[PDB]
């Protein structure tokens, strides 16, 4: 009879960045998926592998709730198969995904008149990411200039660059607080119910 909190990972006060996304494993629930539907605020609600009218009538093994803040344009790289900076260097979804990518719009929350330099994303990496892989190595990157001594000269960059979040950016440069629910449908004792 305990309803597991979507009041802790959805209407949270500050979301983590893209290079370090949170994850809260949700277990032992009576899971009310009906507060997710009844809002026009949730901009994109794409469910892959599971029809959204049958979320209330399904039982799973684990629910992973990932959370980050990306630009408006990038809310279409969080999908199976796409490329671009967010989906190869920051947070890659697998091909056989069974989840529900949810993302509303928050420009009243994550923006300042001079800029919001809290949220950050990655720029370069030697290999593109494996599924659900997270790395928070903020080292002064080896891009060439093979004697590297740290002082960030020519041919060596920082691997993070911040977002510029102002209210006067349009739609393509506004924060969209994505939450990626990921159902683990493995033949097991059924944990989370309806």
């Amino acid at each position, epitope marked *: 009879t305990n309803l597991c909190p979507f009041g802790e990972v959805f209407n949270a006060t500050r979301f983590a960045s893209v290079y370090a996304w949170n994850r809260k494993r949700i277990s032992n629930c009576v899971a009310d998926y009906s507060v997710l*539907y*009844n*809002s*026009a605020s949730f*901009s*994109t*609600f*794409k*469910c892959y592998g599971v*029809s*959204p*009218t049958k979320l209330n009538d399904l039982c799973f093994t684990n629910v992973y709730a990932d959370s980050f803040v990306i630009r*408006g344009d990038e*809310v*279409r*790289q969080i*999908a*199976p*198969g*796409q490329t*671009g900076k967010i989906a190869d260097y920051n947070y890659k979804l697998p*091909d056989d995904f069974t989840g529900c990518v949810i*993302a509303w719009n928050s420009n009243n929350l994550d923006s300042k008149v001079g800029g919001n330099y809290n949220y950050r994303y990655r720029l370069f990496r030697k290999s593109n990411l494996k599924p659900f892989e997270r790395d928070i190595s903020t080292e002064i990157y080896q891009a060439g200039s093979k004697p590297c001594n740290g002082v960030e000269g020519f041919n060596c960059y920082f691997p993070l660059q911040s977002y510029g979040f102002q209210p006067t950016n349009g*739609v393509g440069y506004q924060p969209y607080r994505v939450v990626v629910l990921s159902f683990e449908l493995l033949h097991a004792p059924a944990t989370v119910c309806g």
Partner: antibody
Amino acid sequence: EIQLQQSGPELVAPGASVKVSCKASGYAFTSYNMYWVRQSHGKSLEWIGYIVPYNGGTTYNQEFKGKATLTVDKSSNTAYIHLNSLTSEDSAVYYCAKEGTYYGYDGVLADWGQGTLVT
Amino acid sequence: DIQMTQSSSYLSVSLGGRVTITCKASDHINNWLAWYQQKPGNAPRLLISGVTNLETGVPSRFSGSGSGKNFTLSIASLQTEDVATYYCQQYWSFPWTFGGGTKLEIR
């Protein structure tokens, strides 16, 4: 801009098979579910299904699963529908139309093609 | 295969007045409704995504309303560029069924 163009009007006899192209240009083609929809003359629209372009996994309607089969080509940025075993009852206007670029819900259609009046 | 209906296939009001289109749905849909406008000989365009939220590029005379099973559209003061059909649409379950439609004529 976001431009969707198709073929021209067609003309085949009862009991034939056609295919009309739909060439998308102006966005990342591997990043939108390209739908289809049929509209008879003077009536409401009716669905066919959608194809996800990076994979080729197709979904079809209940009354259209025998006639229409969709395919895609990532190189030419074209989405084809292959209509087989037609009648005179299947004489309508066919659109290919993606969803909105910042809306994201799985069923809205915010920019539409021209339409091939199939007879 | 959810069915969706409309009040009248022809609703004729005069210029500059008010029109109130009605769209009842069969099953329970929360707010997932759209509308369209098909001027004849051309492709439709999405007007009101969601039950109330207007899209970018439409005049603000349009205002979606309603909840539950019956939703309504209402135009503030009609012009001569809005004399087309208006298809109601759900997007809840897979056969994303369109409504009936109501072509308009000035009276």
